[PDB]
Every structure is written in C-alpha cells, then in structure tokens.
Amino acid sequence: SQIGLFSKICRVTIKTLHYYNKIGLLVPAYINPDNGYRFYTSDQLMKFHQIASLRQLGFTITEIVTLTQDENSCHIIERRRLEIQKQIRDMADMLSRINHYLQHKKKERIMLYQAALKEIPECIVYSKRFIVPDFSSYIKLIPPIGQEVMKANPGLTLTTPAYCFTLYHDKEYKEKNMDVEFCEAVNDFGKNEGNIIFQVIPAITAVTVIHKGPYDSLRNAYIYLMQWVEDNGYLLTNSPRESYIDGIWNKQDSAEWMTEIQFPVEKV
Amino acid sequence: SQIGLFSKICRVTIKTLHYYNKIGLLVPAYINPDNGYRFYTSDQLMKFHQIASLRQLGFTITEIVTLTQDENSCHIIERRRLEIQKQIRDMADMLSRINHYLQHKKKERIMLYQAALKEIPECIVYSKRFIVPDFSSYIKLIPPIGQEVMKANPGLTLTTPAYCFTLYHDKEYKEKNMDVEFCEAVNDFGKNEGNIIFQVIPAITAVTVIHKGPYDSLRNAYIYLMQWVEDNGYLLTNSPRESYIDGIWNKQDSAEWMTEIQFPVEKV
Ligand code: 118
Ligand code: 118
C-alpha cells in the first residue's frame, strides 16, 4: 500500500505521513530503495490508530513517541491530566473575562477602562499609616515626607522603576475617615526613625486598571474593579494599592495624569 | 525611558517590545535616528496595558492589531467567546477521556484496545439485511454472495480504499439469529437484485477500535466501546458498524487478522 492509498485509508494528509516517518513515529513497512517510495501495511495502520487515539487527547507528538516506544509511562498520562485540568481552570477564567468584556462593551460604547491581571514582586518600602481627614488633604502631607526622609536618610536611593503607592486599609467606602497608608518602594532596608517605618510588602497577584485623568473619577474605576471582582469570582486578599505613575511632577496638565489601581485577588 | 527601564516597568521582556515594535502594535514614541535606541512614554504604558489585557483573554496578536485600532469591531469578541467555548467543551471531553484511560490501566494490566474518533463519509453501498443463524455460516456465506454480485453486475467496480462492512440492527444481545446487514461501498449506483438492495449510507462520526487477532474475541472490543460510551458521556446514535480490514481473503493465519469496529456515536 503506497502512501496515497494509506493516507486515504487513514484519512490523513500525505505530509503527515512524511512527518511521522521523519520523526520516527510511524515508519513505513518497506521503503523502496531507488525511488524512495514508502509502502505501508496493516501493521502500520494498527499503529496509526494508536497515534490518533493519543493525539485526540491532546498529547504532544514527543509524548506520543515516549508512550508508544517506552511502556510503564503512567506519570506522563498524569502530567497530561493535571495540565488539562489546569488549562480548564484557566479556560473558565478566560471565559468569565470575555463574558465580562462583552457585557461592558455592550454597556458603554467606548471602553475607558481595561482590566489586566499582573503579578507584583516583593518590595522594600518606607510607609506611614495614618488616618486622613479627606482625600484632598491626603496630597498635602506627602511632600513633607518626601523632603524629610531624604534629609533623615542620607544616600537612601529609591528603586527603579519607582513604585510609589497607597494601601487602603478601609474595608468600606467613606470620604472623611480614610485609614490610609502611604508606601514608597526603596532599594535597601534602613532606619525606622519617626512615624515612617520600613517593611517588605509580599509579592501579590493583582488585577490592575490604569486611570488616566483627574482624581475625581477614580470611583468609576474602583466600582469597575469591584464589578470585575464580583463577576469573575475573585476574592480580595489584601489591601488595595494606588500606584502614582505620572502626575504633576512630570507634566503640568492634570487631565493627562495617570495612576494604576491594584486589587490583590485570588480566584475563589 | 529606554527599552530596559520600560521593560522593567511593565515586567516584560525586551524581546517582547522588539517584536511588538516590529509588528506595528505599540511602536515607541521616539526612535533615536542615530543609534536606533527605542525610548518609551507612559502613553505606551497605557497602550501596553490594554495589549496585555487582550492577550490575557486569548486573542491572537494579529487579532489585537485589528481590535485595538478598529475599536468598533464587535463580532470578534462573541467569535472569540464561541471559539473558547468550543475549546473548553473539547478540553472537558479530553479530560473525561484521560481519566477513563487511567481507570482502564487500573482495570486491565495492558491497554489492549485504544478507542479513537473518526469521521466516516457517506457512501453508495450495496446492502443485504437479513437474519443469520450463526457466525460460521455467515462467514462462509459472504464470499459466494460477493462472487454473485461482482459477476452479475457488469461494469461495477469497487472503491479505493475497499470499505466492506456489516451493521447490527438488533437492540438486545443476540449470540445467534442476528439481524445483520452486510454492505460494501461502490463508486456508483447499481441495480437492485432480489433481497440485496442499493442505498447511500450517511456520513457519521464514530468511535473506532481495532482488534488484531481471531474473531471470537471481538465482543470484548464492543464491551470496551460500551464502557467507553457509557463512561465518557457518549451516546450510540445508530447501529454499530464492523469494518473488515484484513481477514481470510488476504492472510491465512488467524492470529494476524485485523478488524476494526466502528460505533456511530455522539457526545452528551
Ligand atoms: C516622596 C518623594 C516624592 C514623591 Sb512624588 C508624588 C506622588 C504621588 C502623589 C503626590 C506626589 C513622585 C515623583 C516621581 C515618581 C513618582 C512619584 C513628587 C515629586 C516632585 C514634585 C512633586 C511630587 C512622594 C514621596
Ligand atoms: C464482494 C463481497 C465480499 C468480498 Sb471479501 C474482500 C475482498 C477484498 C477486500 C476486502 C474484502 C472475499 C472473501 C473470500 C475470497 C475473496 C474475497 C469478505 C470476506 C469476509 C467478510 C467480508 C468480506 C469481496 C467482494
């Protein structure tokens, strides 16, 4: 049986048989020496059936080679099974994210706020945890901290890139009684003089949105991130962070400012 | 911000930014014309945020290069959603098949049979449906009936490959007096003669199991397929076929006879 007849018996392409002969998965029963013509046999079909049976389970080709040439490989079927359930979990996550994306696109004609899930590494910060009378007043006590720390900690170099964020320890929304905590990432440890203390913040997987524009429409992004959290079955594991990437310090226009809100979450 | 600092901001590889600038998505703000250095801005951070948000949803990159500038394209999200739904339903199918595979290596010391789905196209066959008392007389009675057909039908030529098979139109287990229907695919219509008629047998999806060995143990393959159909959440749609690939016509030793059982099946 030539390769054209075998490809019609097997209902597979000829190039598939060429590839399987090249890699050594399915070798023809007899190859004509002068022409090169591959000839196949029923005993090759009995093996192509096994190849197809394994390949329909999503096994990679090299896994199929290992399974059919070397027996007692029950660890490879377990690896493929665990990977299949992991991919199923990831696929359910992706499905929820794309359903949410369509309900939002069908909600507002322009999408102002995309949501991205990113992992934040561990870091060394100096932090001051304090009760703030108003969000407008929160901005006032930060530049005092910025000069005082550089005067009190000489040669202290902030990391690059600059991770300067806020920990919202409030489990509910309020305007005037915010128990907030100002953090700023630094390269190495230091002295803990004053109300400013040093600490490490654990690496977290967090869903983040970057808000461009003034600080009054941030409630939109928070409700959106909360909406994302309720829609996609995540649970808030830690306090939300507020990372100030660009602001009045690089650019004078207040509507081009940008900050990224991070929601530490786990899928539950 | 040079490509290294920006790549540290986004926690992404420099090769990713190089590739992106190559394909046109996320071109940097300023390309130094002297040395080719790529400099980035926070506006590229905002473009990359949504790039990564779509990439985390499964969209291919060439889908992203249309999705992020032709913002009104909305069919590509329900399209990606239906595509992911098809992939998840297949992954869940594969998961049931691998757990079943594992159960079978627990049940039997050897994976003697290996099931595999295949699509059997529609075909014009000559068919004779009747009741037979046993297997020995049925096996003996087939070849004279074939000589009768191939002689009495001038111009009738067999199909390449040679698909000769049987259907079992019973509903309960009959070891004897089995309402069997023999068919053999022909390239074109011949005229009916007596109890043998011609018809076109519809294209089906079927699970298949090859049995290399004597004929008195093909019932085991059916048992395996029945367990496979009941376990893996499948349903027998039509009468189970049995295709004769190799037999008394090509080889004289019974221990190397290879026959393939086909169960027309659909998933629940
Ligand atoms: C210590 C030192 C600098 C800043 Sb800032 C800032 C950030 C958020 C809200 C208000 C101010 C800063 C600068 C670069 C990168 C990230 C943050 C700052 C610097 C100069 C002038 C005004 C403000 C804060 C603490
Ligand atoms: C018409 C009907 C049946 C057979 Sb065959 C057979 C031949 C070639 C390829 C496939 C099948 C047969 C039997 C004895 C001698 C010569 C040919 C046949 C036998 C048993 C069961 C099914 C088919 C041949 C023509």
mmCIF file of C-alpha atoms in Angstrom, chain B:
data_model
loop_
_atom_site.group_PDB
_atom_site.id
_atom_site.type_symbol
_atom_site.label_atom_id
_atom_site.label_comp_id
_atom_site.label_asym_id
_atom_site.label_seq_id
_atom_site.Cartn_x
_atom_site.Cartn_y
_atom_site.Cartn_z
ATOM 1 C CA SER B 1 12.604 55.833 29.128
ATOM 2 C CA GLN B 2 14.854 53.366 27.324
ATOM 3 C CA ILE B 3 13.660 49.883 26.442
ATOM 4 C CA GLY B 4 15.242 48.324 29.534
ATOM 5 C CA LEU B 5 13.638 50.711 32.001
ATOM 6 C CA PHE B 6 10.276 50.452 30.243
ATOM 7 C CA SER B 7 10.582 46.656 30.154
ATOM 8 C CA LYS B 8 11.237 46.798 33.887
ATOM 9 C CA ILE B 9 8.139 48.961 34.352
ATOM 10 C CA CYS B 10 5.827 46.549 32.554
ATOM 11 C CA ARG B 11 7.627 43.425 33.865
ATOM 12 C CA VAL B 12 8.034 42.171 30.296
ATOM 13 C CA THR B 13 10.941 41.069 28.127
ATOM 14 C CA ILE B 14 12.915 43.390 25.881
ATOM 15 C CA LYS B 15 12.332 40.872 23.082
ATOM 16 C CA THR B 16 8.588 41.367 23.546
ATOM 17 C CA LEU B 17 8.916 45.122 22.975
ATOM 18 C CA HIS B 18 11.189 44.488 19.984
ATOM 19 C CA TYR B 19 8.649 42.087 18.482
ATOM 20 C CA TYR B 20 5.781 44.497 19.163
ATOM 21 C CA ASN B 21 7.575 47.423 17.531
ATOM 22 C CA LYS B 22 8.226 45.104 14.585
ATOM 23 C CA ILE B 23 4.601 44.069 14.015
ATOM 24 C CA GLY B 24 3.404 47.665 14.484
ATOM 25 C CA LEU B 25 1.451 47.330 17.728
ATOM 26 C CA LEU B 26 2.966 49.565 20.444
ATOM 27 C CA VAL B 27 5.535 51.412 18.368
ATOM 28 C CA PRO B 28 7.715 53.539 20.688
ATOM 29 C CA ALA B 29 7.292 57.279 20.982
ATOM 30 C CA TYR B 30 10.806 58.249 19.927
ATOM 31 C CA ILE B 31 13.232 56.168 17.868
ATOM 32 C CA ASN B 32 16.697 57.689 18.074
ATOM 33 C CA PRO B 33 17.716 58.011 14.403
ATOM 34 C CA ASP B 34 21.439 57.806 15.147
ATOM 35 C CA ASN B 35 21.689 54.546 17.104
ATOM 36 C CA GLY B 36 18.141 53.194 16.786
ATOM 37 C CA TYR B 37 17.501 53.347 20.538
ATOM 38 C CA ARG B 38 13.822 52.936 21.416
ATOM 39 C CA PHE B 39 12.519 55.416 24.001
ATOM 40 C CA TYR B 40 9.105 54.985 25.601
ATOM 41 C CA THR B 41 6.484 57.094 27.397
ATOM 42 C CA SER B 42 3.568 56.453 29.747
ATOM 43 C CA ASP B 43 1.247 56.612 26.713
ATOM 44 C CA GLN B 44 2.969 53.408 25.665
ATOM 45 C CA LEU B 45 2.361 52.026 29.121
ATOM 46 C CA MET B 46 -1.337 52.736 28.600
ATOM 47 C CA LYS B 47 -1.310 51.064 25.196
ATOM 48 C CA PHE B 48 0.581 48.045 26.548
ATOM 49 C CA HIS B 49 -1.877 47.726 29.445
ATOM 50 C CA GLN B 50 -4.748 47.040 27.089
ATOM 51 C CA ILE B 51 -2.497 44.932 24.846
ATOM 52 C CA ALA B 52 -1.764 42.681 27.808
ATOM 53 C CA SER B 53 -5.414 42.738 28.895
ATOM 54 C CA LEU B 54 -6.455 41.398 25.496
ATOM 55 C CA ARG B 55 -3.531 38.962 25.328
ATOM 56 C CA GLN B 56 -4.662 37.557 28.682
ATOM 57 C CA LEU B 57 -8.104 36.958 27.110
ATOM 58 C CA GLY B 58 -6.641 34.646 24.467
ATOM 59 C CA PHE B 59 -6.742 36.949 21.454
ATOM 60 C CA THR B 60 -4.001 36.264 18.965
ATOM 61 C CA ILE B 61 -1.649 39.145 18.242
ATOM 62 C CA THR B 62 -2.969 39.684 14.715
ATOM 63 C CA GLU B 63 -6.433 39.863 16.254
ATOM 64 C CA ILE B 64 -5.093 42.527 18.601
ATOM 65 C CA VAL B 65 -3.634 44.592 15.744
ATOM 66 C CA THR B 66 -7.201 44.861 14.411
ATOM 67 C CA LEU B 67 -9.021 45.063 17.781
ATOM 68 C CA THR B 68 -7.088 47.993 19.238
ATOM 69 C CA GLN B 69 -7.422 50.447 16.348
ATOM 70 C CA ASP B 70 -10.704 49.358 14.748
ATOM 71 C CA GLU B 71 -12.410 49.800 18.106
ATOM 72 C CA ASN B 72 -15.925 49.310 16.730
ATOM 73 C CA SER B 73 -15.265 45.720 15.643
ATOM 74 C CA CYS B 74 -17.529 43.778 17.999
ATOM 75 C CA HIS B 75 -18.148 40.458 16.219
ATOM 76 C CA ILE B 76 -14.607 39.327 17.097
ATOM 77 C CA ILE B 77 -15.480 39.106 20.784
ATOM 78 C CA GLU B 78 -18.512 36.846 20.502
ATOM 79 C CA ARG B 79 -16.417 34.989 17.911
ATOM 80 C CA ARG B 80 -13.560 34.535 20.387
ATOM 81 C CA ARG B 81 -16.149 33.547 23.010
ATOM 82 C CA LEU B 82 -17.682 30.820 20.839
ATOM 83 C CA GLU B 83 -14.179 29.645 19.895
ATOM 84 C CA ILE B 84 -13.159 29.377 23.573
ATOM 85 C CA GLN B 85 -16.437 27.590 24.345
ATOM 86 C CA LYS B 86 -15.682 25.019 21.658
ATOM 87 C CA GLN B 87 -12.141 24.583 23.010
ATOM 88 C CA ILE B 88 -13.361 24.189 26.610
ATOM 89 C CA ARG B 89 -16.001 21.629 25.606
ATOM 90 C CA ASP B 90 -13.257 19.708 23.814
ATOM 91 C CA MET B 91 -10.865 20.036 26.758
ATOM 92 C CA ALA B 92 -13.524 18.670 29.114
ATOM 93 C CA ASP B 93 -14.052 15.824 26.642
ATOM 94 C CA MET B 94 -10.289 15.142 26.627
ATOM 95 C CA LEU B 95 -10.315 15.225 30.439
ATOM 96 C CA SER B 96 -13.019 12.577 30.608
ATOM 97 C CA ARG B 97 -11.063 10.514 28.095
ATOM 98 C CA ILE B 98 -7.785 10.732 30.062
ATOM 99 C CA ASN B 99 -9.451 9.857 33.405
ATOM 100 C CA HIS B 100 -11.118 6.912 31.635
ATOM 101 C CA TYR B 101 -7.719 5.961 30.185
ATOM 102 C CA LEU B 102 -6.272 5.970 33.719
ATOM 103 C CA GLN B 103 -9.167 3.875 35.023
ATOM 104 C CA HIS B 104 -8.519 1.358 32.247
ATOM 105 C CA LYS B 105 -4.846 0.985 33.130
ATOM 106 C CA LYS B 106 -6.064 0.292 36.647
ATOM 107 C CA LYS B 107 -8.691 -2.210 35.388
ATOM 108 C CA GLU B 108 -6.529 -4.106 32.848
ATOM 109 C CA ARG B 109 -2.794 -4.672 33.146
ATOM 110 C CA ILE B 110 -2.475 -3.756 29.427
ATOM 111 C CA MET B 111 -4.238 -1.197 27.215
ATOM 112 C CA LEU B 112 -5.178 -3.891 24.728
ATOM 113 C CA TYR B 113 -7.751 -1.705 22.932
ATOM 114 C CA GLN B 114 -7.449 2.027 22.195
ATOM 115 C CA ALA B 115 -10.540 3.955 21.090
ATOM 116 C CA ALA B 116 -10.329 6.795 18.569
ATOM 117 C CA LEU B 117 -12.953 9.017 16.948
ATOM 118 C CA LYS B 118 -13.093 9.238 13.156
ATOM 119 C CA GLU B 119 -15.412 10.699 10.547
ATOM 120 C CA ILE B 120 -16.795 8.141 8.075
ATOM 121 C CA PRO B 121 -18.058 9.906 4.926
ATOM 122 C CA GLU B 122 -21.279 8.972 3.211
ATOM 123 C CA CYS B 123 -21.100 6.282 0.543
ATOM 124 C CA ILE B 124 -23.147 4.364 -2.022
ATOM 125 C CA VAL B 125 -23.158 0.712 -0.897
ATOM 126 C CA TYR B 126 -24.858 -2.498 -1.910
ATOM 127 C CA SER B 127 -26.601 -3.854 1.184
ATOM 128 C CA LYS B 128 -28.343 -7.084 2.200
ATOM 129 C CA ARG B 129 -30.207 -7.034 5.516
ATOM 130 C CA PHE B 130 -31.314 -10.438 6.805
ATOM 131 C CA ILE B 131 -31.158 -12.787 9.795
ATOM 132 C CA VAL B 132 -28.392 -15.354 10.165
ATOM 133 C CA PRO B 133 -28.315 -18.388 12.497
ATOM 134 C CA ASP B 134 -24.625 -18.181 13.453
ATOM 135 C CA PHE B 135 -21.186 -16.798 12.632
ATOM 136 C CA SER B 136 -19.706 -19.835 10.856
ATOM 137 C CA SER B 137 -22.372 -19.973 8.184
ATOM 138 C CA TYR B 138 -22.390 -16.176 7.837
ATOM 139 C CA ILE B 139 -18.606 -16.053 7.283
ATOM 140 C CA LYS B 140 -18.929 -18.926 4.799
ATOM 141 C CA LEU B 141 -21.943 -17.369 3.049
ATOM 142 C CA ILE B 142 -20.350 -13.938 2.450
ATOM 143 C CA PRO B 143 -17.811 -14.842 -0.319
ATOM 144 C CA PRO B 144 -20.252 -16.651 -2.683
ATOM 145 C CA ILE B 145 -22.594 -13.670 -2.293
ATOM 146 C CA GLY B 146 -19.706 -11.442 -3.284
ATOM 147 C CA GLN B 147 -18.908 -13.581 -6.310
ATOM 148 C CA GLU B 148 -22.603 -13.376 -7.247
ATOM 149 C CA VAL B 149 -22.558 -9.580 -7.007
ATOM 150 C CA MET B 150 -19.257 -8.991 -8.795
ATOM 151 C CA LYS B 151 -20.293 -11.339 -11.633
ATOM 152 C CA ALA B 152 -23.968 -10.325 -12.026
ATOM 153 C CA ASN B 153 -23.168 -6.582 -12.126
ATOM 154 C CA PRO B 154 -21.169 -5.714 -15.259
ATOM 155 C CA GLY B 155 -19.167 -2.506 -15.107
ATOM 156 C CA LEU B 156 -19.406 -2.497 -11.302
ATOM 157 C CA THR B 157 -16.002 -1.637 -9.816
ATOM 158 C CA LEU B 158 -15.070 -1.437 -6.129
ATOM 159 C CA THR B 159 -13.984 1.757 -4.371
ATOM 160 C CA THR B 160 -10.452 2.656 -3.387
ATOM 161 C CA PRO B 161 -9.965 2.141 -0.353
ATOM 162 C CA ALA B 162 -12.091 -1.028 -0.038
ATOM 163 C CA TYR B 163 -14.710 -0.299 2.666
ATOM 164 C CA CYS B 164 -16.562 -3.602 3.248
ATOM 165 C CA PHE B 165 -18.509 -3.812 6.488
ATOM 166 C CA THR B 166 -21.530 -5.008 8.456
ATOM 167 C CA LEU B 167 -24.217 -3.366 10.627
ATOM 168 C CA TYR B 168 -26.016 -4.973 13.574
ATOM 169 C CA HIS B 169 -29.589 -3.651 13.661
ATOM 170 C CA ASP B 170 -30.580 -5.508 16.815
ATOM 171 C CA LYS B 171 -31.388 -3.772 20.091
ATOM 172 C CA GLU B 172 -30.590 -6.599 22.523
ATOM 173 C CA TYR B 173 -27.741 -9.105 22.730
ATOM 174 C CA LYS B 174 -28.198 -11.929 20.210
ATOM 175 C CA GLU B 175 -25.421 -14.512 20.233
ATOM 176 C CA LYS B 176 -27.359 -16.240 17.422
ATOM 177 C CA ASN B 177 -30.144 -15.427 14.924
ATOM 178 C CA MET B 178 -28.705 -11.952 14.411
ATOM 179 C CA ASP B 179 -30.464 -9.411 12.152
ATOM 180 C CA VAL B 180 -27.263 -8.481 10.328
ATOM 181 C CA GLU B 181 -26.956 -6.182 7.323
ATOM 182 C CA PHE B 182 -23.917 -6.625 5.078
ATOM 183 C CA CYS B 183 -22.790 -3.680 2.952
ATOM 184 C CA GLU B 184 -19.954 -2.833 0.613
ATOM 185 C CA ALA B 185 -19.276 0.646 -0.768
ATOM 186 C CA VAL B 186 -19.445 1.129 -4.544
ATOM 187 C CA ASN B 187 -18.328 4.089 -6.649
ATOM 188 C CA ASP B 188 -21.806 4.454 -8.138
ATOM 189 C CA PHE B 189 -25.345 3.093 -8.248
ATOM 190 C CA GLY B 190 -26.001 -0.427 -9.456
ATOM 191 C CA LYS B 191 -29.403 -2.008 -9.955
ATOM 192 C CA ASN B 192 -31.156 -3.838 -7.125
ATOM 193 C CA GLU B 193 -31.386 -7.643 -7.321
ATOM 194 C CA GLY B 194 -33.786 -9.560 -5.087
ATOM 195 C CA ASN B 195 -33.219 -9.158 -1.369
ATOM 196 C CA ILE B 196 -29.953 -7.237 -1.897
ATOM 197 C CA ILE B 197 -30.674 -3.535 -2.438
ATOM 198 C CA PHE B 198 -28.501 -0.476 -3.014
ATOM 199 C CA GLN B 199 -28.519 2.661 -0.885
ATOM 200 C CA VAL B 200 -26.341 5.509 0.303
ATOM 201 C CA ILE B 201 -25.199 5.203 3.933
ATOM 202 C CA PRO B 202 -24.934 8.611 5.646
ATOM 203 C CA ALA B 203 -21.735 10.247 6.838
ATOM 204 C CA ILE B 204 -21.277 9.691 10.572
ATOM 205 C CA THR B 205 -18.894 10.435 13.389
ATOM 206 C CA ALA B 206 -17.902 7.193 15.079
ATOM 207 C CA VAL B 207 -15.574 5.891 17.761
ATOM 208 C CA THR B 208 -13.342 3.111 16.449
ATOM 209 C CA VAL B 209 -11.425 0.205 17.977
ATOM 210 C CA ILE B 210 -9.060 -2.064 16.037
ATOM 211 C CA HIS B 211 -8.864 -5.719 17.088
ATOM 212 C CA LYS B 212 -5.840 -7.673 15.873
ATOM 213 C CA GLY B 213 -6.457 -11.360 16.419
ATOM 214 C CA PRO B 214 -9.124 -14.018 15.937
ATOM 215 C CA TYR B 215 -12.787 -13.146 15.515
ATOM 216 C CA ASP B 216 -14.152 -14.902 18.607
ATOM 217 C CA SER B 217 -12.967 -12.076 20.846
ATOM 218 C CA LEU B 218 -14.438 -9.089 19.031
ATOM 219 C CA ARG B 219 -17.237 -8.931 21.651
ATOM 220 C CA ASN B 220 -14.613 -7.673 24.108
ATOM 221 C CA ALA B 221 -13.971 -4.686 21.859
ATOM 222 C CA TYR B 222 -17.697 -3.986 21.895
ATOM 223 C CA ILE B 223 -17.695 -4.255 25.685
ATOM 224 C CA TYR B 224 -14.830 -1.788 25.780
ATOM 225 C CA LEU B 225 -16.663 0.570 23.498
ATOM 226 C CA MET B 226 -19.806 0.179 25.546
ATOM 227 C CA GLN B 227 -17.926 1.065 28.690
ATOM 228 C CA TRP B 228 -16.244 3.863 26.771
ATOM 229 C CA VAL B 229 -19.558 5.136 25.504
ATOM 230 C CA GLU B 230 -21.213 4.970 28.922
ATOM 231 C CA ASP B 231 -18.234 6.303 30.871
ATOM 232 C CA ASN B 232 -17.077 9.154 28.649
ATOM 233 C CA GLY B 233 -20.591 10.567 28.325
ATOM 234 C CA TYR B 234 -21.316 9.370 24.799
ATOM 235 C CA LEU B 235 -24.478 8.006 23.157
ATOM 236 C CA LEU B 236 -24.852 5.393 20.409
ATOM 237 C CA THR B 237 -26.642 7.224 17.621
ATOM 238 C CA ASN B 238 -27.046 4.459 15.021
ATOM 239 C CA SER B 239 -26.465 0.727 14.639
ATOM 240 C CA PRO B 240 -22.834 -0.268 15.329
ATOM 241 C CA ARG B 241 -20.747 -0.989 12.233
ATOM 242 C CA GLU B 242 -17.939 -3.518 11.955
ATOM 243 C CA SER B 243 -15.403 -2.990 9.163
ATOM 244 C CA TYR B 244 -13.371 -5.895 7.785
ATOM 245 C CA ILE B 245 -9.905 -4.549 7.021
ATOM 246 C CA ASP B 246 -7.985 -7.831 6.932
ATOM 247 C CA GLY B 247 -9.336 -11.355 7.010
ATOM 248 C CA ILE B 248 -9.489 -14.703 5.264
ATOM 249 C CA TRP B 249 -9.141 -13.021 1.862
ATOM 250 C CA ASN B 250 -5.636 -11.576 2.446
ATOM 251 C CA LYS B 251 -3.948 -13.786 5.052
ATOM 252 C CA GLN B 252 -4.305 -17.409 6.089
ATOM 253 C CA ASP B 253 -3.220 -17.133 9.734
ATOM 254 C CA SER B 254 -5.994 -16.215 12.170
ATOM 255 C CA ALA B 255 -3.648 -14.679 14.729
ATOM 256 C CA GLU B 256 -2.775 -11.751 12.414
ATOM 257 C CA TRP B 257 -6.330 -10.947 11.259
ATOM 258 C CA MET B 258 -7.037 -7.268 11.976
ATOM 259 C CA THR B 259 -10.628 -5.930 12.015
ATOM 260 C CA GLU B 260 -11.937 -2.511 13.070
ATOM 261 C CA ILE B 261 -15.216 -1.945 14.963
ATOM 262 C CA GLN B 262 -16.998 1.382 14.409
ATOM 263 C CA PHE B 263 -19.590 2.751 16.858
ATOM 264 C CA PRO B 264 -21.586 5.680 15.402
ATOM 265 C CA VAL B 265 -21.537 7.875 18.465
ATOM 266 C CA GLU B 266 -22.260 11.402 19.695
ATOM 267 C CA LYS B 267 -21.388 13.165 22.920
ATOM 268 C CA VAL B 268 -23.924 14.023 25.600
#
